[PDB]
Amino acid sequence: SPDYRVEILSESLPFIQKFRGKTIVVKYGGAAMTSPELKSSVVSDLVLLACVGLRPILVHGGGPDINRYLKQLNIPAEFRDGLRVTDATTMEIVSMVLVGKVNKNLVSLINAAGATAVGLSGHDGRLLTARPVPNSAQLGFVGEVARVDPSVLRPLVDYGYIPVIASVAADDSGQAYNINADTVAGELAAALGAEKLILLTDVAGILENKEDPSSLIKEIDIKGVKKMIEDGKVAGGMIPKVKCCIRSLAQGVKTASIIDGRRQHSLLHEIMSDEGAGTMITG
Amino acid sequence: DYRVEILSESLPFIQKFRGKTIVVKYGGAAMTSPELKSSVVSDLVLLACVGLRPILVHGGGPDINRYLKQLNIPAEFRDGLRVTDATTMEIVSMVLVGKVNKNLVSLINAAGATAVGLSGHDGRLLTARPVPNSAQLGFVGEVARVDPSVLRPLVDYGYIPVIASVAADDSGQAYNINADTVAGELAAALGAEKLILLTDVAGILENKEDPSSLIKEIDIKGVKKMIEDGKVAGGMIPKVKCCIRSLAQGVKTASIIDGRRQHSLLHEIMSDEGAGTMITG
Amino acid sequence: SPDYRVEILSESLPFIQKFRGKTIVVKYGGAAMTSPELKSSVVSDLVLLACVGLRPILVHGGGPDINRYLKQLNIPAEFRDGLRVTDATTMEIVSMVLVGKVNKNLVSLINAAGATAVGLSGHDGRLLTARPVPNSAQLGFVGEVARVDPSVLRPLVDYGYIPVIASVAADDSGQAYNINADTVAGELAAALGAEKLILLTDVAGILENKEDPSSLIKEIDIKGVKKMIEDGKVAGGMIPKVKCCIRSLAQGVKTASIIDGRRQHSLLHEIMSDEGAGTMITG
Amino acid sequence: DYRVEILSESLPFIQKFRGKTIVVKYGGAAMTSPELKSSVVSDLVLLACVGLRPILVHGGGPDINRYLKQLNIPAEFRDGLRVTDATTMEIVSMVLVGKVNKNLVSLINAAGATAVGLSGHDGRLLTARPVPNSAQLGFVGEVARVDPSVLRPLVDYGYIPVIASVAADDSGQAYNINADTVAGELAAALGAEKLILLTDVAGILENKEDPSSLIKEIDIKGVKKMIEDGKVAGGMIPKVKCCIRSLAQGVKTASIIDGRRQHSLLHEIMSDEGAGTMITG
Amino acid sequence: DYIPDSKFYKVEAIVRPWRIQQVSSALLKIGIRGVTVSDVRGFGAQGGSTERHGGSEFSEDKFVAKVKMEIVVKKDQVESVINTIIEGARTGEIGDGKIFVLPVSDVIRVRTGERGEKAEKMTGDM
Amino acid sequence: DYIPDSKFYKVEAIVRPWRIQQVSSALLKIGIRGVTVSDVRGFGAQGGSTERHGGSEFSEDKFVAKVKMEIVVKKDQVESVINTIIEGARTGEIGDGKIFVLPVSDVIRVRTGERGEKAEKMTGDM
Amino acid sequence: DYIPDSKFYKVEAIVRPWRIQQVSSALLKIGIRGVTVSDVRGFGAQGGSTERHGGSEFSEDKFVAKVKMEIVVKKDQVESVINTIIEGARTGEIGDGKIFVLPVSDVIRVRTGERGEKAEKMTGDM
Numbered sequence A, C: 001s002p003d004y005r006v007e008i009l010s011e012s013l014p015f016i017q018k019f020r021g022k023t024i025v026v027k028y029g030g031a032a033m034t035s036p037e038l039k040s041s042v043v044s045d046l047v048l049l050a051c052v053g054l055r056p057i058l059v060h061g062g063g064p065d066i067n068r069y070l071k072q073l074n075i076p077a078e079f080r081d082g083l084r085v086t087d088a089t090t091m092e093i094v095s096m097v098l099v100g101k102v103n104k105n106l107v108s109l110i111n112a113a114g115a116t117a118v119g120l121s122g123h124d125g126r127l128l129t130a131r132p133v134p135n136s137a138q139l140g141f142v143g144e145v146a147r148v149d150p151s152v153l154r155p156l157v158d159y160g161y162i163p164v165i166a167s168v169a170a171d172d173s174g175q176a177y178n179i180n181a182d183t184v185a186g187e188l189a190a191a192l193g194a195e196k197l198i199l200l201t202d203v204a205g206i207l208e209n210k211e212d213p214s215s216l217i218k219e220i221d222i223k224g225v226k227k228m229i230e231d232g233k234v235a236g237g238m239i240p241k242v243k244c245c246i247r248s249l250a251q252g253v254k255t256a257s258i259i260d261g262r263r264q265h266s267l268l269h270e271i272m273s274d275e276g277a278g279t280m281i282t283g
Numbered sequence B, D: 001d002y003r004v005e006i007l008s009e010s011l012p013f014i015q016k017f018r019g020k021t022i023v024v025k026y027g028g029a030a031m032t033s034p035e036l037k038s039s040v041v042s043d044l045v046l047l048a049c050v051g052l053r054p055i056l057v058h059g060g061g062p063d064i065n066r067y068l069k070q071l072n073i074p075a076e077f078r079d080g081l082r083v084t085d086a087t088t089m090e091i092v093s094m095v096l097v098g099k100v101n102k103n104l105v106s107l108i109n110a111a112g113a114t115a116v117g118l119s120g121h122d123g124r125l126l127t128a129r130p131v132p133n134s135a136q137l138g139f140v141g142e143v144a145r146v147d148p149s150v151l152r153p154l155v156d157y158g159y160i161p162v163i164a165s166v167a168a169d170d171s172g173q174a175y176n177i178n179a180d181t182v183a184g185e186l187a188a189a190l191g192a193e194k195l196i197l198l199t200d201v202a203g204i205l206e207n208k209e210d211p212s213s214l215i216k217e218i219d220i221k222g223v224k225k226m227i228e229d230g231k232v233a234g235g236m237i238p239k240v241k242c243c244i245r246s247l248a249q250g251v252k253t254a255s256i257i258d259g260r261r262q263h264s265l266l267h268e269i270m271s272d273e274g275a276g277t278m279i280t281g
Numbered sequence E, F, G: 001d002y003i004p005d006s007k008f009y010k011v012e013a014i015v016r017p018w019r020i021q022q023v024s025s026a027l028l029k030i031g032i033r034g035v036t037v038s039d040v041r042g043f044g045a046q047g048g049s050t051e052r053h054g055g056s057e058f059s060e061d062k063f064v065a066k067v068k069m070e071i072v073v074k075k076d077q078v079e080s081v082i083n084t085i086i087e088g089a090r091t092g093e094i095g096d097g098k099i100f101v102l103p104v105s106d107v108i109r110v111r112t113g114e115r116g117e118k119a120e121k122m123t124g125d126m
């Protein structure tokens, strides 16, 4: 009934005002982008948070989108501990897929939802400076974050634009690097002194057991997640995911959550309720 | 020590267009040659450091063609415009924005300046509508509107804008737009002093054949007659029309210049002769 | 050829960007103002530096201009260690020549060169507060710099005006003092946290031997110049010149140079090349 | 304790012109007397502290004459204007800017305020052109344009502008300008509430002889008739003409007042009677 | 008579901006109760004449700020409007203004729909 | 007939600024495709009447923001323009606006040089 | 002849804003020394036509920035004004402008009080 729906809207008040004016880094994982309906549902949640007084910054990945193009172009793919082995040919393709397909898809969806977005890669405004990883001989053009320069984001946010961040960047000599999207999201959250880092993925959260989707750990600390990596419970793409929480929490980000991007309105369930919608990591 | 006496002599040329906006369309042979490419970058950066407000707009045809043939969906062109279905559109945006745009931005960043690369989607800089020949061409667009809002603070912070020529309509469908068109209409939106187009010819020729009959300076009425009389043809007709279109909207000068020439951009701005044809309002 | 000239312009790029946005205090010595052509050449160099992205502040002297008026008015002149002995009558004349002739000459030349200048003395906006020197009984109304208040310069530079500074000021009681133009330039450079102090004069730089114009010292440190004063190698007007470099360098100015204002475009040769155009003093 | 009850009574007079610009031309007997000089300074500072926005414009004839005769190039005047060749011009600028201007600025600085002294050259505040009688007068100028840009931030920072009446033409040649002219045209540029001229007479007299026939208040049409009828003559004609000229340009009131009177400036502004003749638009 | 004959005329006066309050006040006094003004730019360059605005000089081609007054009245009150404007606006200096008189075929009040004389009449003009 | 007879007339309407979009839309519907507007100030002070603008009261001499609409048309369509403006602009409150009708002797399109009826005609008005 | 006959006419030209300097300069050359301009908004929506301004598209109802030029002259010089405006303002693109010609019954110079021909004459036009 209309009389009941309106009072339910007003019941959201204390939840709306709790993180008013706070910077939240939302990472939208490639694995979560399984449907056009889910893509526009997630940007709906993100737009809702902006209109309601929060300051969301969108970071995205695009692993499966890249993989599809490698298949079409007849290029072998390989991953080690959740990081793509990236030769020169793959770098070019990584950049074109992430920036030219996924980034502009999301920017476009946000513009059609009654907001305005600006899409940036690490290159743009020198937002990120990359650096080769130690095991370049094995991983190729995989980067670590050497510097974040959040300057370009200040006037964009001041004008009411929602930034949408792709995870490629260059070193100082102009050589392009592929940076895992989790790593970017975590270092950006640290640079912005963000209240929260929230990572949307294709599982309920951190699972005690990979095979069992009901072994969801609802909350855990830094000690606890470090142990899960050493015991091997966390593997593949969940390693960089978990590592970006540790690194950002250590740099002053207050909470980090890992949640299921395929559940409807999960981002809202995580922020706008006491239960949340996955795993929260705290210091 | 000849390097500084030359620098001193270029003073009045440096002063003339200080604070003025300049819109440069980069394409053609200037793209395909790494030597010409770094000269354009150099010239852009110099102009920025010297007080001008340059904006770079690019296309990137050859790179698109390469991936289309890798994917067994080879290019189709009608009167200089690419037939663009949904699959082609995705590849066009991938190449122009993900390869070309970020290549130019990184080259500028490495040259000691700082660039920001944007497509028409970003900050709703452009809104497209279907072109008149859309029935044959598919997702090829005209500029329905320009919103230059996002460029204001970027230029204020001293970033060099680098623009890729794709955008969406109001429903969110991506369109492929001719880069000359984007450059002209962007210049009109900013009330730019100059529009500068890099091409694969000396400029506008009196005779389509010999490159010694290059026209230095001509007005709207002049070149409009040259179209009617047939003295200019082919791919040069759309270029002139984009120049007229932005000139009519308040852009002061529009130049079609030889991208094959080293430092052509600097030649066009820093000398009285120029580097091709200047069209005046 | 036109093809060669343009590529030479673009060869100046790394030199242009090297000190972009940096404050440079340029002192234009009275002894260097030997010709109308050289005066407008020097303001050309100064204007060029502004248009190219640097932040030049012009300080000037005018010893020979003063001397000419003392001769005409039948007033004896005297100097001790490069400082003018200044009685009450001479003070008035010093102020009228420096502010009313030289300052407005330079302001006028800059306005005719496609820029806009604002001429100030130490009085104006209380830019400088003077104080009598210890040996007042001998030197008369010769001042030291007691305070610099750079406030008036902030809105002028914000509006794109090139300041042009004359070296007279008052104490707090309103008594006028003659301050050597080198001393002013050096203390102003310190107040502005300037990258460079560059003094244009009528010799190649600091000479090992006054008589021999080929004994140019190309570079030297604070220890080295202090020794030259004690050994007597530096005399007359070169004493305050050298002393203002020591004082400003000690207060955080990064480099100080002494160069020949009569050589064409020497200011540009000093900044826009590795060799420079005279003596550079470093800490 | 009578000092504070008087202060309290001047409240409505203090409130009336708050935030308003006032242009004061200082010259004559108010200059030659150290006692009157410190009263003018006092009055200026008080007005600034009390919320008005005063600007001081000065001449300085007697000081110029002294140096000209020291240099054996004695003064020549035609109808109240100095014949100014290149040598005289240099001395004029030396005295007005280097002596008088900085004298007034230092006196204001010592009175607990802060002044900035400017000539027409500074910030291109004034551009001169040759006066109609330039053939006889040499480098004597009319105001071709005022650019009040430089005064905006100085007044915002709370500095008191002090203006010397020399400037250049567009080529850079220095000109000697009548201080009344500079004050009037500066008032017009700022849309000033008031122009106030200090002179050596009570104001505008009904009869050129007796000082008891002083006109308190009159309009443009009124004094323009007084010129035609010959009731006002001599050096007072140029003064009235400068008042009309700035009044016609939007200045609200123009007053010619007795500089010989102690605190005349305060009398003019802080009382209903005034200190001479008010001319209204 | 005004050569194109008409029941109403528009008096169009381009004058100095700082005179508008005074002219409006004076017009109100003689019963002129409908007035429209707008900001304009113009030049009126006679001979070699130079005009002063903002302390600066304006010759020929160079535009100067003005205000345009528009007053629509019956034929008979046209002279009173012109004269009242002249007295209120005149300084005697170059650039005082130009007045134009144009025929108006009809007047309509939006609120009521009154046409002609009823629409022109304001209930307090004598 | 409109007393100064002419092939064209200019309809000049001074109305409330917030009504311009609605009047323009309604004019477009009946085939009026050429319209010029500008910001003006005015007063229309009948009797003792007081006008409300921005929540404030305006009597006699005091200026109020308005917009001036100018529409040039053939003689026959003048009535439709007037009526369309009235319906779109009327609130029923004091200060709704005045309309003037002035004769226009000629119309010229800059792009083509078309004079008179051809210049007035817009290819989509029925 | 212009059908409402008159001693003077006002040439009213609504054109692109960036062309004003050129038209004014050209008018000055043929002895037109009195010109008034003001900022306006307008639409001239023929058929399906689309107009470009600021890189954007404007159809029907949507307002576009323009400038209104007003020149008052003797009957005989009206054609020269129209032609001079057209040459100076024309680009060949949709939205180049409209010119109107209106009868003016009188001209008055505020400074002197000169009426009619004397008031219209500027001492430097041949």
Ligand SMILES: Nc1ncnc2c1ncn2[C@@H]1O[C@H](COP(=O)(O)OP(=O)(O)OP(=O)(O)O)[C@@H](O)[C@H]1O
Pocket (backbone or CB within 6 Å): E014, E015, E041, E042, E043, E044, E045, E046, E064, E066, E093, E094, E095, E096, E097, E098, G033, G034, G035, G036, G037, G070, G071, G072, G073, G109, G111, G112, G119, G122
């Ligand atoms: N013929 C004209 N057509 C249109 N507007 C005019 C005309 N003449 C004058 N104006 C307007 O009136 C303004 C001011 O009047 P202006 O001083 O130009 O008249 P004038 O004939 O030159 O008389 P004066 O000799 O007193 O200057 C001009 O700036 C212009 O906007």
Ligand SMILES: Nc1ncnc2c1ncn2[C@@H]1O[C@H](COP(=O)(O)OP(=O)(O)OP(=O)(O)O)[C@@H](O)[C@H]1O
Pocket (backbone or CB within 6 Å): E033, E034, E035, E036, E037, E070, E071, E072, E073, E109, E111, E112, E119, E122, F014, F015, F041, F042, F043, F044, F045, F046, F064, F066, F093, F094, F095, F096, F097, F098
């Ligand atoms: N006679 C006139 N001449 C010029 N402009 C006028 C005239 N009458 C009205 N206007 C303009 O029209 C505006 C608004 O109309 P207004 O309300 O004044 O008409 P009104 O006759 O007073 O009718 P109402 O009784 O409805 O107020 C005025 O502010 C003024 O700008």
Ligand SMILES: Nc1ncnc2c1ncn2[C@@H]1O[C@H](COP(=O)(O)OP(=O)(O)OP(=O)(O)O)[C@@H](O)[C@H]1O
Pocket (backbone or CB within 6 Å): F033, F034, F035, F036, F037, F070, F071, F072, F073, F109, F111, F112, F119, F122, G014, G015, G041, G042, G043, G044, G045, G046, G064, G066, G093, G094, G095, G096, G097, G098
């Ligand atoms: N009938 C009219 N009444 C009032 N103003 C008009 C009229 N027609 C045009 N205008 C004004 O002139 C401006 C520009 O001319 P416009 O392009 O509209 O003419 P047009 O007849 O459409 O010719 P074109 O086909 O060249 O566009 C319009 O924006 C409008 O302000």
Ligand SMILES: Nc1ncnc2c1ncn2[C@@H]1O[C@H](COP(=O)(O)OP(=O)(O)O)[C@@H](O)[C@H]1O
Pocket (backbone or CB within 6 Å): A029, A030, A031, A032, A061, A062, A063, A082, A200, A201, A202, A203, A205, A206, A207, A208, A209, A210, A233, A234, A235, A236, A237, A238, A239, A241
């Ligand atoms: N302990 C764990 N809990 C949940 N998922 C895990 C765990 N260990 C490994 N994974 C894997 O990590 C994947 C998420 O990372 P990834 O595939 O990179 O997706 P994204 O696009 O979100 O980065 C899950 O789909 C799952 O296969």
Ligand SMILES: Nc1ncnc2c1ncn2[C@@H]1O[C@H](COP(=O)(O)OP(=O)(O)O)[C@@H](O)[C@H]1O
Pocket (backbone or CB within 6 Å): B027, B028, B029, B198, B199, B200, B201, B203, B204, B205, B206, B207, B208, B231, B232, B233, B234, B235, B236, B237
């Ligand atoms: N009068 C003319 N002057 C110059 N080029 C002309 C003329 N007429 C026709 N053309 C042709 O138009 C073409 C325009 O260049 P185009 O290949 O479209 O440039 P781009 O590929 O960079 O878009 C030229 O290659 C030239 O052959």
Ligand SMILES: Nc1ncnc2c1ncn2[C@@H]1O[C@H](COP(=O)(O)OP(=O)(O)O)[C@@H](O)[C@H]1O
Pocket (backbone or CB within 6 Å): C029, C030, C031, C032, C061, C062, C063, C082, C200, C201, C202, C203, C205, C206, C207, C208, C209, C210, C233, C234, C235, C236, C237, C238, C239, C241
């Ligand atoms: N060691 C030295 N090297 C160079 N010049 C010296 C030296 N010692 C003294 N001088 C003198 O100092 C002069 C420069 O100072 P000064 O005459 O005050 O000119 P400025 O106007 O530049 O202050 C030179 O012309 C020279 O005569």
Ligand SMILES: Nc1ncnc2c1ncn2[C@@H]1O[C@H](COP(=O)(O)OP(=O)(O)O)[C@@H](O)[C@H]1O
Pocket (backbone or CB within 6 Å): D027, D028, D029, D198, D199, D200, D201, D203, D204, D205, D206, D207, D208, D231, D232, D233, D234, D235, D236, D237
């Ligand atoms: N009606 C009048 N009222 C006042 N002074 C007049 C009148 N007619 C002529 N004068 C003369 O004009 C002169 C104007 O003063 P002036 O000496 O020019 O002032 P300053 O020297 O300060 O410029 C007065 O000295 C006075 O003798």
Ligand SMILES: CC(=O)N[C@@H](CCC(=O)O)C(=O)O
Pocket (backbone or CB within 6 Å): A029, A030, A060, A061, A062, A063, A066, A082, A083, A084, A094, A142, A143, A167, A178, A179, A180, A181, A182
């Ligand atoms: C290094 C690396 O793993 N890069 C990623 C970035 C995209 C993502 O994280 O979703 C990749 O898949 O190529």
Ligand SMILES: CC(=O)N[C@@H](CCC(=O)O)C(=O)O
Pocket (backbone or CB within 6 Å): B027, B058, B059, B060, B061, B064, B080, B081, B082, B092, B140, B165, B176, B177, B178, B179, B180
């Ligand atoms: C439509 C069209 O041809 N777009 C281009 C964009 C590149 C360019 O303009 O240079 C294309 O090649 O697909």
Ligand SMILES: CC(=O)N[C@@H](CCC(=O)O)C(=O)O
Pocket (backbone or CB within 6 Å): C029, C030, C060, C061, C062, C063, C066, C082, C083, C084, C094, C142, C143, C167, C178, C179, C180, C181, C182
């Ligand atoms: C004290 C002193 O030497 N003052 C200097 C200032 C001018 C200059 O340094 O060139 C003088 O010559 O009077």
Ligand SMILES: CC(=O)N[C@@H](CCC(=O)O)C(=O)O
Pocket (backbone or CB within 6 Å): D027, D058, D059, D060, D061, D064, D080, D081, D082, D092, D140, D165, D176, D177, D178, D179, D180
């Ligand atoms: C031209 C002229 O007489 N200028 C003045 C300036 C002084 C003043 O106006 O008081 C002069 O005496 O030289």
Ligand SMILES: NC(=[NH2+])NCCC[C@H](N)C(=O)O
Pocket (backbone or CB within 6 Å): A218, A219, A255, A257, A270, A271, A272, A273, A274, A275, A276, A277, A278, A279, A280
């Ligand atoms: N296990 C969880 N995910 N808990 C989430 C806590 C929810 C809370 N509203 C927050 O963001 O701070």
Ligand SMILES: NC(=[NH2+])NCCC[C@H](N)C(=O)O
Pocket (backbone or CB within 6 Å): B215, B216, B217, B253, B255, B268, B269, B270, B271, B272, B273, B274, B275, B276, B277, B278
């Ligand atoms: N025909 C030409 N290409 N002319 C170029 C003119 C050059 C001039 N320095 C400018 O940029 O405006």
Ligand SMILES: NC(=[NH2+])NCCC[C@H](N)C(=O)O
Pocket (backbone or CB within 6 Å): C218, C219, C255, C257, C270, C271, C272, C273, C274, C275, C276, C277, C278, C279, C280
């Ligand atoms: N001996 C010298 N003067 N050296 C000058 C060094 C030049 C260098 N470009 C600088 O200003 O820092």
Ligand SMILES: NC(=[NH2+])NCCC[C@H](N)C(=O)O
Pocket (backbone or CB within 6 Å): D215, D216, D217, D253, D255, D268, D269, D270, D271, D272, D273, D274, D275, D276, D277, D278
């Ligand atoms: N005739 C006069 N002097 N009148 C002076 C008027 C005084 C008034 N306090 C004002 O300054 O406006």
Ligand SMILES: [Mg+2]
Pocket (backbone or CB within 6 Å): A082, A182, A237, A238, A240, A241
């Ligand atoms: Mg992952």
